[PDB]
């Protein structure tokens, strides 16, 4: 009795699940070959990024022992990146399988203390990257909930966009890096909140008369702005 | 030709992906949903109403708010069944043995 007879059609019919498998098993059904994803991009550890940090490009220090070999983003990518899907794009900034800095705690109180001091979250350390489908599902659920909360709100799509950008930047495993990208939509939402409030509660101000040189040149048109 | 997409253009890449031989319905990508809170919420509501765990499990039903169904499965029903029969008989359509049905379906769906 053999194990898994009808379960390896990929092997029976030389069907590669990816160019890496194609190159390995020598099926040669990918016309464009394969450019291997190097190990520094397949795995690695979290690193400091800012140039205004002294330990820049150095691995992040944790209470537990950690391999300090870092994930290197793709800084000099090739001109042709035939697969421009999220699957192949995410590997340039994160490792699909997650970082290699996860702990195996010898006890429960060590885990407790790390969490209590803000140095561990399983959501952040024991996890992979999110697939495009998962990101879209989360975004659409959040959008439905926001619409149900209030349809006649102006900052709705702004909140949805900051959520979307966090999910796309993988804030679960890179919260600081993702906030660095989403704080702009947060700020726009703040502005829209003030604007909606001032439109609801009539808030206006006495505008001063028009300046003597409002137009730089007499022949120039003074486009009227509300 | 296919240039790298920076990390700042990924939100638009998710809902307007590039063209591929097997594209999704971009107009329907905002409609793909799968609620992870369905059964927890159902149980919470029922237990708050006052039912027991067994009654809740008997009254539970799967989520209807999932990704909509393809209208082709209802409009091109007969053509799809014929194509599947052709495939089952001809080993998956090797060396263009179901081109007939596949092309009929493609024309019906595309119309130039």
């Amino acid at each position: 009795s053999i194990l898994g007879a009808e379960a390896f059609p990929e092997l029976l019919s030389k069907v590669p699940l990816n160019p890496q498998m194609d190159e390995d098993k020598h099926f040669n059904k990918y016309k464009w070959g394969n450019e291997p994803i190097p190990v520094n991009r397949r795995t690695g550890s979290r690193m400091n990024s800012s140039i205004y940090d002294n330990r820049n490009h150095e691995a992040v220090r944790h209470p537990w022992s950690t391999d300090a070999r870092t994930f290197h983003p793709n800084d000099n990518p090739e001109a042709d990146r035939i697969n421009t899907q999220y699957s192949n794009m995410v590997s340039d900034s994160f490792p699909e399988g997650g970082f290699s800095d996860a702990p195996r705690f010898s006890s429960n109180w060590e885990r407790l203390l790390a969490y209590h001091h803000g140095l561990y979250s399983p959501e952040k350390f024991n996890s992979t990257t999110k697939t495009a489908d998962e990101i879209r599902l989360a975004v659409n659920d959040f959008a439905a909930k926001v619409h149900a909360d209030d349809p006649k709100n102006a900052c709705k799509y702004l909140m949805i966009e900051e959520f979307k950008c966090l999910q796309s930047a993988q804030a679960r495993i890179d919260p600081q890096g993702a906030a660095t990208k989403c704080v702009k939509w947060f700020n726009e939402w703040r502005q829209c909140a003030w604007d909606q409030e001032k439109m609801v509660k009539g808030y206006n101000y006495i505008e001063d008369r028009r300046a003597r040189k409002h137009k730089p040149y007499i022949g120039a048109p003074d486009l009227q702005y509300s | 030709a296919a240039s790298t997409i920076p990390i700042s253009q990924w939100p638009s890449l998710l809902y307007a992906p590039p063209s591929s031989p097997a594209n999704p319905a971009v107009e329907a990508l905002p409609e793909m949903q799968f609620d992870d809170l369905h059964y927890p919420r159902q149980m919470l509501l029922c237990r708050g109403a006052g039912y027991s765990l067994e009654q809740c499990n008997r009254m539970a039903q799967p989520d209807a708010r999932v990704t909509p169904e393809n209208p082709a499965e209802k409009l091109l029903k007969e053509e799809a069944v014929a194509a599947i029969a052709c495939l089952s008989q001809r080993e998956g359509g090797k060396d263009e043995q179901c081109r007939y049905y596949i092309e009929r379906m493609y024309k019906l769906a595309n119309k130039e």
Binding site: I160, E161 | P30
Partner: peptide, 8 residues
């Protein structure tokens, strides 16, 4: 569609 997918 959403108003933020528009760029032009």
């Amino acid at each position: 569609a959403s108003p933020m997918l528009f760029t032009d």
